[PDB]
Amino acid sequence: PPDLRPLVPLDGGRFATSDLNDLYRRVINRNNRLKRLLDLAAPDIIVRNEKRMLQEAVDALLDNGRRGRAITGSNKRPLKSLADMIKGKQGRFRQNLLGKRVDYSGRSVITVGPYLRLHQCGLPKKMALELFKPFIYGKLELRGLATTIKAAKKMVEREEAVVWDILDEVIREHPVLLNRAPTLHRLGIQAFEPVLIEGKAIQLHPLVCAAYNADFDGDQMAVHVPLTLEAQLEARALMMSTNNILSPANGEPIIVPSQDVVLGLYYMTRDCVNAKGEGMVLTGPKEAERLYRSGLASLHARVKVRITEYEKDANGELVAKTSLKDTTVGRAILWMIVPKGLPYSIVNQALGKKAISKMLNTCYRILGLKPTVIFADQIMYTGFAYAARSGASVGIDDMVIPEKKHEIISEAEAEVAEIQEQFQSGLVTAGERYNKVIDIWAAANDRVSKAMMDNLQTETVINRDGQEEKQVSFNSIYMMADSGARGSAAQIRQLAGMRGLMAKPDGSIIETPITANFREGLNVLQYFISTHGARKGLADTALKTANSGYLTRRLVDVAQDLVVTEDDCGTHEGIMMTPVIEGGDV
Amino acid sequence: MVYSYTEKKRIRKDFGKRPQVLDVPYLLSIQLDSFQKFIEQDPEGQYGLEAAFRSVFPIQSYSGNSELQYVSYRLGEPVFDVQECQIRGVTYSAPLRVKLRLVIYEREAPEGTVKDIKEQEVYMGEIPLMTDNGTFVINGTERVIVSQLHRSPGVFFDSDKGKTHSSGKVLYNARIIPYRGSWLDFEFDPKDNLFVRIDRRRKLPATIILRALNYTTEQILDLFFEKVIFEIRDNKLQMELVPERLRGETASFDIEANGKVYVEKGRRITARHIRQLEKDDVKLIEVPVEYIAGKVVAKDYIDESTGELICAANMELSLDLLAKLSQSGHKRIETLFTNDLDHGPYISETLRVDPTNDRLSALVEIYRMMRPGEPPTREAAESLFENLFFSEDRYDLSAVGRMKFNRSLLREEIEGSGILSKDDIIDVMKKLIDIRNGKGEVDDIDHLGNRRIRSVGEMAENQFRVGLVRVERAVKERLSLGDLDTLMPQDMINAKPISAAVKEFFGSSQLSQFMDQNNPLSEITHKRRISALGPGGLTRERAGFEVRDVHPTHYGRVCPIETPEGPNIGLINSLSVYAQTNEYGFLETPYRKVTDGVVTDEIHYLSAIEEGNYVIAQANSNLDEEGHFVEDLVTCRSKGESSLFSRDQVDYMDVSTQQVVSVGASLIPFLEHDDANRALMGANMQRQAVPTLRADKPLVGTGMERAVAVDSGVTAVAKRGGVVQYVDASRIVIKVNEDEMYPGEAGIDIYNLTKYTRSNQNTCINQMPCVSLGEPVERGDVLADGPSTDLGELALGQNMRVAFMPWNGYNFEDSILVSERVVQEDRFTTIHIQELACVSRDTKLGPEEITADIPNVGEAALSKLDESGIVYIGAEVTGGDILVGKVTPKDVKDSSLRVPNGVSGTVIDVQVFTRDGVEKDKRALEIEEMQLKQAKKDLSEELQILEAGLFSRIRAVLVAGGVEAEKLDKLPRDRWLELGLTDEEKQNQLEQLAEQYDELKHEFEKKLEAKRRKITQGDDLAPGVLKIVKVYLAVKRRIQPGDKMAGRHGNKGVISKINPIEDMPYDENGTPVDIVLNPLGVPSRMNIGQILETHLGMAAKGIGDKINAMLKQQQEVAKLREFIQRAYDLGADVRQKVDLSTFSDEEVMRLAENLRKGMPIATPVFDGAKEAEIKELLKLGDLPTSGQIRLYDGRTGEQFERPVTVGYMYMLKLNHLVDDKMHARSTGSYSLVTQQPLGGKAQFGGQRFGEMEVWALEAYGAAYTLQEMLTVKSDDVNGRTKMYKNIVDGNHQMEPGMPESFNVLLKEIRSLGINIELEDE
Amino acid sequence: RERMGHIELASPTAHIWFLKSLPSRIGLLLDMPLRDIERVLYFESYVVI
RNA sequence: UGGCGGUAGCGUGC
DNA sequence: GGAAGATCGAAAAAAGCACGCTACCGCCCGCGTGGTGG
DNA sequence: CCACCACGCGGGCGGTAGCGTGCTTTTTTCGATCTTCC
Ligand SMILES: [Mg+2]
């Protein structure tokens, strides 16, 4: 049909002709020429050549490029035949059937809103007004403000106060589907309740960020508006963020503090040695908080508080036990936000990221799902507030260089020099001396890292009430490394200790390692050596994204028609699962 | 050393101890000079247009009586300059006129002497010229042609690492890559056979090529093998034995000579036997008759008695054949020396598998392989073979190609013919055989010494040569077609092919990219870019891992950190600061020669190939006085690896520490403290910062800002020294010095600054004067600051006060908290200029015209429009407003241009383009009047200066005749010239001066006439359009949540909240912080450079605050001088020395005024200030050395529990604005084919629900949501209408219907001859 | 958007999908090599019937 | 306001 | 001892190369042939 | 008599030939041996 091959009207009177029209014209011209020559009784060779050319034209129209030279376009491109636009990524199946552009959709960058709840997301007023235009029109017509669609459109365009009130009314509990571009798994799209904000950026709940794999460094996300009762209820009951707390891949929880909540909780749940107000006796967590706020007791002071904890009875009831516990002011303050069922032992520790995740999992297992979201929200609020109050900062003096690094470097260099001179004397070959140098440098790097960790983790000294003693370090870098907020042991080693050996792009290791810290300067040679690994990793990621996507698509297709259609088969067969053991470990 | 005038205003405190031995060269030298090589009149035909003409011309027709020859070429004066070409949208180019001589030979004469000659000048198209900033103006748009890194022509040897044949065996191959010709490849078969391929076709034996080169089997065997002589003595077959040939084999018999049994039967041959043989000097040896049976004969042997050959050449011997040879009278035979480890019999096996046996057969086979189907014949095959590799037309090995070919083959001379030869192919085969045997080694494809750089000039020359060969084919046809009685060379040739080729190359090529004008750094990076893509290069998808890696040879030539991230990573690079290009296209880097253990001053430029031979010491090497090395075992790099060496083994030293970084990567302070990935991201994101309305100098810099700003064309530099005669916000007029004066010149330089002109990224280009009235200037001094430039220093961002601490989770991972002061102080607002073009065409029904009256519109809509139908300049408009009123006949329908929805701003510029022969509206008249007024103002200034000079001369002449001071002063200025005088030479000189004055007046009048004619000249347009109206809209965009900002260390984020000023934390003095950042991003990203930059900025701001406080108290100049001298003298053996005693006591005041905002600090890329220097600088001010103070919470009030890191950091605003990304749609236009919503924000389309989203919805189980989003939202037209009506009616129900895309697919499949239908049953 | 047309070919032409897409349907049905099918189709060699 | 090709950029283990 | 099934490696042909989004440029046959005007 | 504008009908482009040339995996076919027998 002509509309499937339309003639686009261009400016100036020209017409854009699709490749299908050109191929059809070629076929028609060839057929007419063949008919005319057959009428004229042409010799055998001429009519045979005409028939061959007609066959070639028909083949090109049906599927261009299959045989012989493909018919070229205006600017030396193959023409798009009938089969060219059916298959492939740009074909009809993968461009207009599996996926398609939709209405009632928008796109905007995403920021962080700490005040939002787990089921709430910020939506700009302009985007909400644009997306919910038909609903506003319907409500305006119902209210009698506008007697026709044109009047409603004009009123919405003019943006009076009544329009804003109607917009606020229509999105009271209307979920919106927020989705990110790399939808690797089902968690990439989730339903949220919109909260009207002014601006042009969507506000996202921090706790779901790990689910979205989204960083606030220019990320853009799309929002779709479900527009029927079935879709609204499906979003509320199935794709709501409050219902997605366990990862279907492995069952591990997905709502976990990542960077700031963990640091705040770790700082609050930490004990000093001679902090202000130590040794006091408190009647409850409320007194502890009123002491901390009044600036009369430190957050790390070790005190004894009388607290009541609720334990779940066998029949399902809660029994209250009151006892005096030796703890810190911060732990007592944090205990109040903990629900009744949980015991006090969860918060009586440093409470790192793993401890926080374990506490959340225990709360979900014992209390259930309804208190779990409230507990997570309270945890995030308290962590953010106390991280702000702590004022943790990174400085050039935080990353301390061990005083024994110079001696270790000197002795390693002396050993390398003696190995080199022994090789020059002919006792050992190139491979043996290379292996010896590599082992010596690896041992030196390990010793440097160990000395750095020893000097950073606990080398702090504090004067208690009477003498001096040691304790866990309060260094900011160590604080965020031990709590699991950010960084790791290797990263801290690269910052303060030696960078270690580096490998050339081929794969072999370089004899001379980078013996310079990141705090200290790196000369040109060390930076040039280190650039190889970064370039290799970046290239690997760039060429790996496409392969991972292709594998995911193939796996999705190979299992696209498997659903649970039965309850039991009565089969007496199965796999005999046993623990897996390889070598000398399980 | 004396500071320049532009530097004395604000001297940057420069850290670093390594003296500057070589200054940074001109950044835009790779491009400009190259194009100069394309334009310069070469006395010899080896470069550019002259070389192309000499290669093509002269041409001889088929008949011997015709000839055409080329004499000289000349590039004409461009009609329009760069500014006119840019504003009018025409291409900036120059005419090319070539002197051509057509010679008609005397055909009647047997010798064909010259009979007639006709010389003329022929115009041969337009050549696009290159502007002074290294960029082209194509169709009024700025385009940049990036250099291409391609494979160097020559011979390259390689081998697969056992991947093929699935056993790990290496198949060695060699390739001959010519600049213009057919590729020739040789490969080793798994069966150890030589094969030859041409242009990647089916493999053929190389012996076929050898036979086609007129080589017999005997000659081939002699060339590729060493003969072994077997002589038939009276007995025991004495043979000439070479002891070295006995190595690596076994004792087939009892080797005994002169009654001495050297080796017994069946014993392995060890080196002792060969050394014994060499010492004893034994030549002849006994050999059993059976031992020959394994040998292969070397040449044909024919019996004289029978006349028939007993055995031909190259086959294995046998006992019966040996007996036949012995009884035929033969006494001496020759065989091939074959070894299984040293000299393999590859040639013999290839000859065995070769079916051909003569030159004619080989030529026929080659012709059949090259041109299948055509009937082979002797003449055609011979011609094809001769023209394939031995014709200057079809085959052309470039000079660099010949040099590489000679160097690879170890030839002495590096100059040779541009075509191949028998010796070259023989040597290539011999080298391949040697490599297969074990001698030598393969070449590295990724080695930078095997890769060439092609600039714009080379590609332009290639395209011009293609056009030239097309034109010469046309002229060859025309000369024979026509009769030479009356032909003229003007009409003999055509210029369309050359013009089309050059236009396509300069406008529609993969390397002529759209130049980005985000900031001068972006332009510099784009101009200094190397791309491996393009024609005759690598492919983005088919690249691999090896090509994207950082080769060791990249040191000093290609920046390792400056490269795009994503699909094309490692295929695009940036030239180093000091890197340049050889005459052969190879990259080279400077070095300092070291003689006798000391470092000299001479600079030697070393390429990649020759650098490996020498030992080069790293830049970070401590040197004492006179250049000796303080330490003996210094670190160097010998051959692609780094190791320790003695101080006497060094040969060259690095020129500077910035040798390996690019221009973009050298602007990051404390780079050595930053991770490679974060450094790469920061370098890539530096060139994306939009220019702010008020440029702010960087407190912490690297000292390269001045070079980047000066080299880029954004700033206006002084061509000649002098004083500023008249400084204005729009133009600058300076009076040149008498030393730099020229004869017959007024001596006034006029610079017209460009104000509020949109860039390629819709930003604002503004130039503001940086000099005052009467301020002396020198050559090269900056007169006006370009966009994002402050006093000649690049200024991409602003020095913002920052504090590293979490704040209620608002910063969280990467988000940025911004105080309200940043918005209040207007520190990040940008200006964006947008085009709006309305076209009045000529429809077939009638010509549409622009008028002020539009049917069925309100008066308020056209109130902004004037009586000419165009919106008033300076009038603020919003979305939906009418700008230009255009109506087209149907009686007339409204087609007036309107402001796009969601777009506001103020109209700042209106341009009208009218086709020639059409009356011009009064708006165009006003614009032309304004341009004429400006030109007349400039010419009137020049005329008044020259007239003042002439009238001073005539006054002096009159005074010489007679003083008449009172009479002269009491006379009008113009009446002076006519005053009479006595009959003498005074009257003669007076009338000569009058003649000069009137001649000058006439000359300036005709110059004004030419200028006005040029400005009023009608411009050509497209066919069918009679008018164009362009309107510029200017918008001030302010910072807000969602905008993306970043620093120089790869730390990026988006604004999360515009916090109130009182909410931000404040110090003891009560000054709040402006920016709050999360420390959590520091340890993970390794970017400790930002912390050091923050500390240095805090120290600089403390110094500036002390200076400002001293200034406020009106302290005497002595205290200011002492304090500034103490501040500058701080450091540890810094190379920079500043003396304030020679500042005339007045420039100190200006320096203090400039520094009151903060002392600038220059931190080199690898020779920066240490932590001790930063702490000392902090101690100089009244700031703590630790760099952390105690902050108070703005909202709550008490002290923070721990000190926080505060300071001043350079922040950049990237070109990613939230208002440019925000988009929403409920309903709108749909595609006319698939009936689906459009795509993109510009088309008001909807977001695409891809396959991954569909899979996620299926996993969730939301069947109804998927069904409604698939059918009733996108495709089902009836479903869409019904759903809209239901929503308007308040009913939330839908009808699934049937998507239109499925119907389209069904119809398309039916059109394919396949019946597909829906079966209801 | 639904009505289709038809062109009456002067001589029959084979479908490229059923001829070139390996395995060739025509060749498999006729038990003859694909090269012979291409030779007869594009007027290179006669075929007995 | 309709699409193709080329180019460049953004978000994608820190 | 010649013909048919085996096979075997080597070569040739076909299909694929993540997902969203933004901006710019270029193009949307074209060339001979007849009509008509200066 | 020459130059600009409209209109219809083929098709690789342009040339008295040649243009290409940095991927991997799977499927099909074919010459060449082979090998196994009837
Ligand atoms: Mg990100």
Author numbering:
A (entry chain J): 246 to 831
B (entry chain I): 1 to 890, 912 to 1342
C (entry chain J): 99 to 147
What did the paper state?
RfaH, a paralog of the universally conserved NusG, binds to RNA polymerases (RNAP) and ribosomes to activate expression of virulence genes. In free, autoinhibited RfaH, an α-helical KOW domain sequesters the RNAP-binding site. Upon recruitment to RNAP paused at an ops site, KOW is released and refolds into a β-barrel, which binds the ribosome. RfaH recruitment requires a 12-nucleotide (nt) operon polarity suppressor (ops) sequence, which induces RNAP pausing.
To answer this question, we subjected opsPECRec after NTP addition and heating (37 oC) to cryoEM/SPA, yielding a cryoEM reconstruction at 3.0 Å resolution. The resulting complex was nearly identical to opsPECRec with a major exception: a clear additional density in the secondary channel showed that the transcript had been elongated by at least two nts followed by RNAP backtracking. These findings establish that opsPECRec is elongation-competent (i.e., can transiently adopt a post-translocated state) and that, following nucleotide addition, RNAP slides back, generating opsPECBack. Third, we present a structure of RfaH fully engaged with RNAP in an even deeper paused state, which is likely necessary to recruit the pioneering ribosome. Fourth, we present a structure that captures an unsuccessful attempt of RfaH-bound RNAP to escape the recruitment site, leading to a backtracked state which is rescued by accessory factors. We do not observe scrunching, but the transition to opsPECBack must be accompanied by at least two translocation steps and likely requires scrunching, as proposed earlier.
